[PDB]
């Protein structure tokens, strides 16, 4: 199981994968990518 949920904390344009991933590592996720036109931060974990 791949948990691909959106960052509840990261309000607005994530702009880069790295920025998204950093907040997600804080917020209990193994990584994350910055989705679409780089607003939504959607983060990876193994469930």
Short mmCIF file of N, CA, C and O in Angstrom, two decimals, residues 1-29:
data_model
loop_
_atom_site.label_atom_id
_atom_site.label_comp_id
_atom_site.label_asym_id
_atom_site.label_seq_id
_atom_site.Cartn_x
_atom_site.Cartn_y
_atom_site.Cartn_z
N UNK A 1 0.74 -1.28 0.00
CA UNK A 1 0.00 0.00 0.00
C UNK A 1 0.76 1.31 0.00
O UNK A 1 1.78 1.50 0.63
N UNK A 2 0.36 1.99 -1.05
CA UNK A 2 0.89 3.32 -1.36
C UNK A 2 -0.19 4.32 -0.98
O UNK A 2 -1.37 4.18 -1.30
N UNK A 3 0.25 5.09 0.01
CA UNK A 3 -0.53 6.22 0.53
C UNK A 3 -0.05 7.51 -0.14
O UNK A 3 1.15 7.76 -0.22
N UNK A 4 -0.99 7.97 -0.95
CA UNK A 4 -0.84 9.19 -1.75
C UNK A 4 -1.88 10.25 -1.39
O UNK A 4 -2.85 10.49 -2.11
N UNK A 5 -1.66 10.86 -0.24
CA UNK A 5 -2.58 11.88 0.30
C UNK A 5 -2.01 13.30 0.25
O UNK A 5 -0.79 13.50 0.24
N UNK A 6 -2.93 14.25 0.21
CA UNK A 6 -2.54 15.67 0.11
C UNK A 6 -2.30 16.35 1.45
O UNK A 6 -3.03 16.18 2.43
N UNK A 7 -1.21 17.13 1.42
CA UNK A 7 -0.72 17.94 2.54
C UNK A 7 -1.73 18.91 3.16
O UNK A 7 -1.99 20.00 2.66
N UNK A 8 -2.25 18.46 4.29
CA UNK A 8 -3.02 19.30 5.22
C UNK A 8 -2.05 20.04 6.17
O UNK A 8 -1.61 19.55 7.20
N UNK A 9 -1.70 21.25 5.72
CA UNK A 9 -0.70 22.12 6.36
C UNK A 9 -0.10 23.08 5.32
O UNK A 9 -0.17 24.30 5.48
N UNK A 10 0.29 22.50 4.20
CA UNK A 10 0.87 23.25 3.07
C UNK A 10 -0.22 23.95 2.24
O UNK A 10 -0.84 23.40 1.32
N UNK A 11 -0.47 25.17 2.67
CA UNK A 11 -1.46 26.07 2.07
C UNK A 11 -0.86 26.88 0.91
O UNK A 11 0.03 27.71 1.10
N UNK A 12 -1.19 26.40 -0.29
CA UNK A 12 -0.93 27.14 -1.54
C UNK A 12 0.09 26.50 -2.50
O UNK A 12 0.21 25.27 -2.54
N UNK A 13 0.73 27.32 -3.36
CA UNK A 13 1.67 26.83 -4.41
C UNK A 13 2.96 26.20 -3.85
O UNK A 13 3.85 26.90 -3.37
N UNK A 14 3.02 24.87 -3.95
CA UNK A 14 4.22 24.09 -3.56
C UNK A 14 5.46 24.34 -4.44
O UNK A 14 6.59 24.10 -4.00
N UNK A 15 5.21 24.65 -5.71
CA UNK A 15 6.14 25.08 -6.77
C UNK A 15 7.21 24.11 -7.25
O UNK A 15 7.56 24.08 -8.44
N UNK A 16 7.71 23.29 -6.34
CA UNK A 16 8.69 22.24 -6.63
C UNK A 16 8.44 21.02 -5.73
O UNK A 16 7.96 21.12 -4.61
N UNK A 17 8.65 19.86 -6.35
CA UNK A 17 8.66 18.55 -5.68
C UNK A 17 9.40 18.53 -4.33
O UNK A 17 8.80 18.18 -3.31
N UNK A 18 10.55 19.20 -4.31
CA UNK A 18 11.44 19.25 -3.14
C UNK A 18 10.79 19.97 -1.95
O UNK A 18 10.72 19.41 -0.85
N UNK A 19 10.19 21.12 -2.23
CA UNK A 19 9.40 21.90 -1.24
C UNK A 19 8.24 21.12 -0.62
O UNK A 19 8.15 21.00 0.60
N UNK A 20 7.46 20.45 -1.48
CA UNK A 20 6.39 19.53 -1.08
C UNK A 20 6.90 18.40 -0.16
O UNK A 20 6.53 18.32 1.01
N UNK A 21 7.90 17.68 -0.68
CA UNK A 21 8.58 16.56 0.00
C UNK A 21 9.15 16.89 1.39
O UNK A 21 9.02 16.09 2.32
N UNK A 22 9.67 18.10 1.55
CA UNK A 22 10.24 18.57 2.83
C UNK A 22 9.19 18.71 3.95
O UNK A 22 9.35 18.13 5.02
N UNK A 23 8.06 19.35 3.62
CA UNK A 23 6.92 19.52 4.54
C UNK A 23 6.32 18.16 4.91
O UNK A 23 5.98 17.90 6.05
N UNK A 24 6.23 17.29 3.90
CA UNK A 24 5.72 15.93 4.07
C UNK A 24 6.57 15.01 4.96
O UNK A 24 6.02 14.36 5.84
N UNK A 25 7.89 15.16 4.87
CA UNK A 25 8.82 14.48 5.81
C UNK A 25 8.64 14.92 7.27
O UNK A 25 8.62 14.09 8.16
N UNK A 26 8.35 16.20 7.45
CA UNK A 26 7.90 16.77 8.75
C UNK A 26 6.55 16.17 9.19
O UNK A 26 6.39 15.73 10.32
N UNK A 27 5.62 16.08 8.23
CA UNK A 27 4.22 15.70 8.46
C UNK A 27 3.93 14.17 8.39
O UNK A 27 2.78 13.76 8.23
N UNK A 28 4.98 13.37 8.52
CA UNK A 28 4.91 11.89 8.68
C UNK A 28 4.91 11.06 7.39
O UNK A 28 4.78 9.84 7.45
N UNK A 29 5.19 11.70 6.26
CA UNK A 29 5.24 11.07 4.92
C UNK A 29 6.69 10.88 4.49
O UNK A 29 7.53 11.77 4.62
#
